[PDB]
Amino acid sequence: KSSCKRHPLYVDFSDVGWNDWIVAPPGYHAMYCHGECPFPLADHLNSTNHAIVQTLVNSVNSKIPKACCVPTELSAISMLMLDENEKVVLKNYQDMVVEGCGCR
Amino acid sequence: KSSCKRHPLYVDFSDVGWNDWIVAPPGYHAMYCHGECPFPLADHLNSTNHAIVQTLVNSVNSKIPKACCVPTELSAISMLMLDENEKVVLKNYQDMVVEGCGCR
Amino acid sequence: WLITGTEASCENEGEVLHIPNITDNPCISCVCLNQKAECKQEKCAPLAEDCALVVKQTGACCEKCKG
Amino acid sequence: WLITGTEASCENEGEVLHIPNITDNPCISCVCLNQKAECKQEKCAPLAEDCALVVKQTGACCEKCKG
């Protein structure tokens, strides 16, 4: 039914069990990707060649899955964490916030 | 459930309906990715930071889906196609063969 | 270990560093030294064991007895 | 198209191109011209309409009537 698309999601580190090594932030807006990668192809959706090929294969052999809707542009955030032995250290974490989605 | 890995797939251009504009090759081994991105996380799989976060969320809020197993390394091929005038052009197509899979 | 990180660099030796989303919590401060970010989490005095009301000053980290 | 490609290029003028999975078909051949690999697909003469057995010389492109 609904097509590939970014969606809201707030991630709260206490809820995830990480509060004890991540001192800050307490959480962040990660967002996520969900929705069908359909056939007919949808002109507005970003898909690799392989994804297109695979959509077509799926359309006649359905033991081959449709392409998946996944993050396609991500961005980083900073976190302040506790190392091996209690030293507060600041790191940048790649690929943490979904910026855009696509079919892969 | 079996976990995220690459699978063999030969795609036959004549079957997807494309042989009328693609003259060579008659097909190719495209492979595909399929399998669960599980929890507990599996050390051997490659997951994007966001995928790891999303795996944890899912483990607690099953309405947020698991990360999805998709091609993370692809390679290109050459095909001899056929333009609007029947001219015979040789082109390279990116992202057509799955070299490796991962959770995204 | 679960999520993967690269430690942050910075440019101006010895001066206060403001990291959006990190350093705006009153109890967290950073300073650029050795081309990298050293941050601290300040700790607070325990307080009069009969305090019933507590307030913190704007921008202050530790709460104190209002009364 | 439906799938997206870009035109290939080659270096040396008039060079016989050997392209894996295209060129290995005895009926297809390419050459470099204008920094572009131009390929041709040879066509075979229609054969006797009373033929009952055709044959191809090892690695030749067109079948001929053997009987």
Interface of B with C in 37-66 (CB under 8 A): 41, 49, 52-53
Q: Spell out the alpha helix ranges (H) of chain B.
A: 13-16, 49-58
From the list B34, B50, B57, the residue facing A65 with the nearest CB is B34
Residue from A103, A88, A1 nearest A43 by CA: A103
* Residue B36: Cβ within 10 Å count: 16
Domain extent at residue C19: 1-67
> Strand B27-29 relative to strand B10-12: parallel, antiparallel, unpaired?
antiparallel
* Residues of B in Cβ contact (< 8 Å) with A71: 48, 50, 104
**Angle, CA A85 vertex, CA C15 and CA C19 arms, to 5°:** 30
The three-class DSSP label of residue A56 is: helix
Q: How many domains does chain A have?
A: 1
- Structural domain of A9: 1-104
Residue in chain C nearest B51 by alpha carbon: C3
What subunits make at least 3 CB pairs under 8 angstroms with D?
A: A, B
DSSP lists the bridge partners of residue C36 as C9
Say what the alpha-carbon torsion angle A100, A104, B3, B9 is, to the nearest 10 degrees.
Answer: 180
Radius of gyration in angstroms for the set of CA atoms belonging to chain A, rounded to a whole number: 18
Touch of B by C (3+ CB pairs closer than 8 Å)? yes
Residue of A5, A10, A54, A62 to mutate, testing the B interface (most B Cβ within 10 Å of its Cβ):
A54
CA dist., res. B96 & res. A66, Å (int): 15
Interface probe, candidates B11, B80, B87, chain D, greatest D C-beta count within 10 A: B80
Resolution in Å equals 2.7
**Would you call C8 helix, strand, or coil by DSSP?**
coil
* Domain count for chain D: 1
Q: Could you tell me which of B13, A49, B78, B20 has the C-alpha nearest to residue D39?
A: B78
- Taking the Cβ of residue B95 and every Cβ of chain A, the question of whether any pair is shorter than 8 Å is answered with yes
Neighboring chain B residues of D40 at a CB cutoff of 8 Å: 88
- By C-alpha distance, the chain D residue nearest B79 is D22
Phi, psi of A19 (to 5 degrees): -45, -30
Neighbours of A74 (CB within 10 A): 18
* CA pseudo-torsion sign A50, A52, A53, A55: positive
E strand or H helix that includes residue B11 = strand B10-12
Which CATH number covers residue A4?
A: 2.10.90.10
**The dihedral of CA A50, A54, A56, A57: what is its sign?**
positive
CATH number of the domain where residue D58 is located:
6.20.200.20
A74 — phi, psi (to 5°)?
A: -120, 165
CA-based nearest residue in chain B for residue A71? B104
Q: Using DSSP bridges, classify how beta strands C28-32 and D37-41 pair: parallel, antiparallel or unpaired.
A: unpaired
